[PDB]
C-alpha cells in the first residue's frame, strides 16, 4: 500500500515540473520508489503478505512489482531519444501515460479480488493504445491498436461473465477464500466452458500459437517506452492470472490442458523457427518473446511445483532480456532510421561496447547457465519430462532454434563487414550504455541468490 | 561486359594448370605437365573455324570439371583462401575520424590538420567533378561502369574520394 | 587486349592521389603528444638503478616482480581460502568430506594404535 500512493504522487510530479526538469524529476522518483518496492520481496513463509483488506502480496507477486517499479526508469531514459523535439505538454502527457501505467500494474499484482484484479488487468489497456498509436512511428500503428485491444477484450470479456458467475455460486472470489474454500470441478459440459472462459482471457495476453497476431503487430510499431513495458510486464499480466485462477479449475485442468499446452508446445518450436527467417530486427524479439512466453504456458498447465517455479523464473528473466533487446533495437534503429535487419551490419567495429551489450543480451536470451533464463527453462523441462518423456524432444528442439536466432542477430548486425554508405552512426551516448547496464546488471547479480525469483512454491 | 572467345580460353588455361599444380605438387612433375598443357593448348592454334573453336572449348571445360582437384588449391588472399577478408575486423572507414573527441584529435594534431586539408580538396572539387561528369555522360546515363578520367588540369578524376581514401589492406 | 589509354591516364591520377593519401597517414615524431599522468614513486626507484643494466640489477627487479606478484596472487587467496573452509565451510558438517586413507594389513592407527593383522601366508608364487 505504501508503494501506490507515491506512484500516484508522481502524477503531479511530472505534470507540474519545470520545462527541462520533467524528466530529471520523474527519473529520480521512479528510482527512489524502487526502494519501497524492493521491500516487497521481503516476505514471510508460506503465508502470503496481506497488509490490507484490498491489497496483498506473496512470493509470486513480489518479483513482478519490483520489476515494474524498476522498469519505469528504463522507459524514461529510453524515451529520451525521440521525445526531445515534441512540445512540453505532449512530453508531460507521455510521462502521464507511463506513470498511469505503473499505477495499474502496481495494483493488479496486489489485488486480492478476482474482479478487482480483472478491472485493473484490462484497465492497463487504456494507457497502452495511447502510447502505441499517438506516439508510434510507422503507418500501421493505427492497425496496431485495433489488433491489440480487440484481441484482448474478445477473451477478457467472457472472463468477466465467468467471474460474476463464480461470485453468485460460491459467494466470493478473494484469492485466499477460493484457495481455502476450494471445490473440485466436475466434468459437466457447463464446467468445460467455464474453464475455457477462465483460461482464454489470460491466453490471449500470453501469445499462443494462433492467438499471437498482435505480438508482431504491436511490439514492432510501438514506441520504445511502450515496447519494453508491453513485452516485459504486460505479457506477464496473464502469467499472474493463470497462476492464481488455476486454484479453482481442478481437476478439469489436467484433462482440458491437452488442446492448449500442446498448441504452445508445437507453436513454440514454430515461433522460434520464425525468428530464423526474419527481415525486421524488432520482429525477432517479438517472435522470440512468443516462443519464450509460450514455454511457461506448458509449465502452468502441468500445475507441477517445479513447473511453477520455472515459470516464474523465466517470467521475470524473459521480461528483463526482452526489454533489453528492444533497447538495442532502438539504438540501431535510431542511428540508421530503419528496422531492416540486413541494413546495418558490422556495427561492432564502430561501437565495441554496444556489441558487448548485444553479446550479453543475445547470450542471456540463449539461456546459458547459470542465468535466470536457464534455471527457469530447466525447471520447466524437468517438470515436463515427469509429465511425459517425449516432452524433451520438442521443448529441447526449441533450444536448438533458440541458440540459432539469438546468435543470428548478433552475427549479421555486429559481426561481419560494415556497410560503407551508412555515414550516420556516432559514438554511443552514456544514456543507452547506462540503459543497457541497468538492464544487464540486475539480471546477472540476481543469479547468485535467485530465491526471490522462483516463487511461492519455492 | 563480355567474356569473348579470347579471354575464355585465357581464363580456362589459368584454372587448368593451377589445378595441375594442385595435382602434381612437386615442381618437376608440375613443369612437365604444364608444358604439355601448354603444348596441347596451341597444337590447334590455327583453328580459324569458330564453330570448331567453340567445340574445342567443350572438351576443355567438362573434363576440367572432372579433372579439377576435389580439394582445389587457393592462395590465402584470393577467393576461397584461408585469409580472405581476414582483416576486415580492423578496417574502419575513414569517416569515423571526425567523430573523435577534442582530446582524441588533439592526440594526433598533425594528421587531423592534414585530414582537414584532405577534406578541403573533396569539398571544392566535388562540384567540378560532378559537372565534368554530367557534360561527358552519354544520354540515358553511362553505358559502362568505367569512370572517365580527369579531362583538364586541376580537377581530380571524377568520383575519387572513396577509391583514394580506401582503408589500407593491412590496417591494424 | 589491354587498357585503353584513358583508363590508365585516370589510374595514375588515382595513383598519385593515393600516393598523397597514405603519405599523410604517418605520424610526426611528436604525435602522439602523450598527455601528462600522475606517476607513482614505485617506478621512479626502479629506473633509478635500472640504467646500469648489469645482470644482478635486473634479476632482483624480476625477483621482486615474482614475489610481489606471488603475495597478491598466491598469498592473499590462500589467506581467505583457508579462512573460508576451515572456519566457514568445515564449520558446516558434510560440506568437506574426505576419503579415509586405505589401511593395509600391517599399518598402525595414530589414535587407536592397534595394528591390523598381517594377511596370512602367501601361496609362495615365484617365477
Amino acid at each position: 500500500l505504501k508503494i501506490i500512493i507515491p506512484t500516484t504522487m508522481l502524477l503531479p510530479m511530472t505534470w507540474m515540473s519545470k520545462h527541462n526538469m520533467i524528466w530529471i524529476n520523474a527519473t529520480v522518483h521512479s528510482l527512489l520508489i524502487s526502494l519501497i518496492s524492493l521491500s516487497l520481496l521481503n516476505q514471510l513463509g508460506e503465508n502470503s503478505l496481506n497488509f490490507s483488506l484490498t491489497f496483498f502480496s506473496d512470493s509470486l507477486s513480489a518479483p513482478l512489482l519490483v520489476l515494474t517499479t524498476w522498469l519505469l526508469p528504463l522507459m524514461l531514459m529510453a524515451s529520451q531519444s525521440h521525445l526531445s523535439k515534441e512540445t512540453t505538454t505532449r512530453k508531460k502527457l507521455y510521462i502521464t501515460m507511463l506513470i498511469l501505467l505503473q499505477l495499474f500494474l502496481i495494483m493488479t499484482f496486489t489485488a486480492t479480488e478476482l474482479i478487482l484484479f480483472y478491472i485493473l488487468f484490462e484497465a492497463t489497456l487504456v494507457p497502452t493504445l495511447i502510447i502505441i498509436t499517438r506516439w508510434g512511428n510507422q503507418t500501421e500503428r493505427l492497425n496496431a491498436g485495433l489488433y491489440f485491444l480487440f484481441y484482448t477484450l474478445a477473451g477478457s470479456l467472457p472472463l468477466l461473465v465467468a467471474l460474476v458467475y463464480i461470485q453468485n455460486t460460491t459467494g466470493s472470489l478473494n484469492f485466499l477464500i477460493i484457495h481455502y474454500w476450494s471445490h473440485p470441478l466436475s466434468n459437466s459440459w457447463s464446467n468445460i466452458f467455464m474453464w475455457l472462459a477462465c483460461i482464454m482471457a489470460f491466453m490471449v495476453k500470453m501469445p499462443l500459437y494462433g492467438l499471437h497476431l498482435w505480438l508482431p503487430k504491436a511490439h514492432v510499431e510501438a514506441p520504445i517506452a511502450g515496447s519494453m513495458v508491453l513485452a516485459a510486464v504486460l505479457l506477464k499480466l496473464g502469467g499472474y492470472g493463470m497462476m492464481r485462477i488455476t486454484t479453482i479449475l481442478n481437476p478439469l485442468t489436467n484433462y482440458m490442458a491437452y488442446p492448449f499446452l500442446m498448441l504452445s508446445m508445437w507453436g513454440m518450436i514454430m515461433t522460434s523457427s520464425i525468428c530464423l527467417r526474419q527481415t525486421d530486427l524488432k520482429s525477432l524479439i517479438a517472435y522470440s518473446s512468443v516462443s519464450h512466453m509460450a514455454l511457461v504456458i506448458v509449465a502452468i498447465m502441468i500445475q507441477t511445483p517445479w513447473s511453477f517455479m520455472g515459470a516464474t523464473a523465466l517470467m521475470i528473466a524473459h521480461g528483463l532480456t526482452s526489454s533489453m533487446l528492444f533497447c538495442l533495437a532502438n539504438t540501431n534503429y535510431e542511428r540508421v532510421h530503419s528496422r531492416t535487419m540486413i541494413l546495418a551490419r558490422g556495427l561492432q567495429t564502430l561501437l565495441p561496447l554496444m556489441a558487448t551489450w548485444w553479446l550479453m543480451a543475445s547470450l542471456t536470451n540463449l539461456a546459458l547457465p547459470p542465468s535466470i533464463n536457464l534455471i527457469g527453462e530447466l525447471f520447466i523441462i524437468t517438470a515436463s519430462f515427469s509429465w511425459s518423456n517425449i516432452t524433451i524432444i520438442l521443448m529441447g528442439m526449441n533450444m536448438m532454434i533458440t541458440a540459432l536466432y539469438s546468435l543470428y542477430m548478433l552475427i549479421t548486425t555486429q559481426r561481419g563487414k560494415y556497410t560503407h554508405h551508412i555515414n550516420n552512426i556516432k559514438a554511443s551516448f552514456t544514456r543507452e550504455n547506462a540503459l543497457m547496464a541497468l538492464h544487464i546488471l540486475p539480471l546477472l547479480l540476481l543469479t547468485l541468490n535467485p530465491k526471490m525469483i522462483l516463487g511461492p512454491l519455492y | 561486359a563480355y567474356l569473348t572467345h579470347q579471354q575464355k580460353v585465357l581464363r580456362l588455361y589459368k584454372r587448368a594448370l593451377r589445378h595441375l599444380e594442385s595435382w602434381c605438387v612437386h615442381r618437376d612433375k608440375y613443369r612437365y605437365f604444364a608444358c604439355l598443357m601448354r603444348a596441347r593448348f596451341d597444337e590447334h592454334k590455327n583453328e580459324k573455324d569458330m564453330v570448331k573453336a567453340t567445340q574445342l572449348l567443350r572438351q576443355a571445360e567438362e573434363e576440367f570439371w572432372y579433372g579439377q582437384h576435389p580439394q582445389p588449391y587457393i592462395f590465402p588472399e584470393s577467393p576461397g583462401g584461408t585469409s580472405y577478408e581476414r582483416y576486415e575486423c580492423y578496417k574502419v572507414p575513414e569517416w569515423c575520424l571526425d567523430d573523435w573527441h577534442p582530446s582524441e584529435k588533439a592526440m594526433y594534431p598533425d594528421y587531423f590538420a592534414k585530414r582537414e586539408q584532405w577534406k578541403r580538396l573533396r569539398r571544392e572539387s566535388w562540384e567540378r567533378e560532378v559537372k565534368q561528369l554530367q557534360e561527358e555522360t552519354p544520354p540515358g546515363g553511362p553505358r559502362t561502369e568505367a569512370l572517365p578520367p580527369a579531362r583538364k588540369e586541376g580537377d581530380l578524376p571524377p568520383l575519387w574520394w572513396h577509391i583514394v581514401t580506401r582503408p589500407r589492406e593491412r590496417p591494424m | 587486349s589491354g587498357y585503353t589509354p584513358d583508363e590508365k591516364l585516370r589510374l595514375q591520377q588515382l595513383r598519385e592521389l593515393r600516393r598523397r593519401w597514405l603519405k599523410d597517414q604517418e605520424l610526426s615524431p611528436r604525435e602522439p603528444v602523450l598527455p601528462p599522468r600522475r606517476v607513482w614513486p614505485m617506478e621512479q626507484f626502479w629506473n633509478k638503478f635500472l640504467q646500469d643494466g648489469a645482470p644482478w640489477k635486473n634479476v632482483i627487479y624480476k625477483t621482486y616482480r615474482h614475489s610481489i606478484f606471488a603475495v597478491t596472487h598466491v598469498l592473499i587467496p590462500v589467506w581467505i581460502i583457508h579462512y573460508y573452509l576451515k572456519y566457514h565451510v568445515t564449520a558446516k558438517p558434510y560440506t568437506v568430506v574426505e576419503r579415509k586413507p586405505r589401511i593395509f594389513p600391517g599399518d598402525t592407527i595414530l589414535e587407536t594404535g592397534e595394528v591390523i593383522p598381517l594377511m596370512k601366508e602367501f601361496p609362495d608364487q615365484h617365477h
Binding site: - | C96, E104 | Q25, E26, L27
Partner: peptide
C-alpha cells in the same frame, strides 16, 4: 616506420 591506425572513438 609506423603508420597511424584508425579506430572508433573509445573516449566516450
Amino acid at each position: 616506420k609506423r603508420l597511424f591506425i584508425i579506430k572508433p572513438s573509445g573516449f566516450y
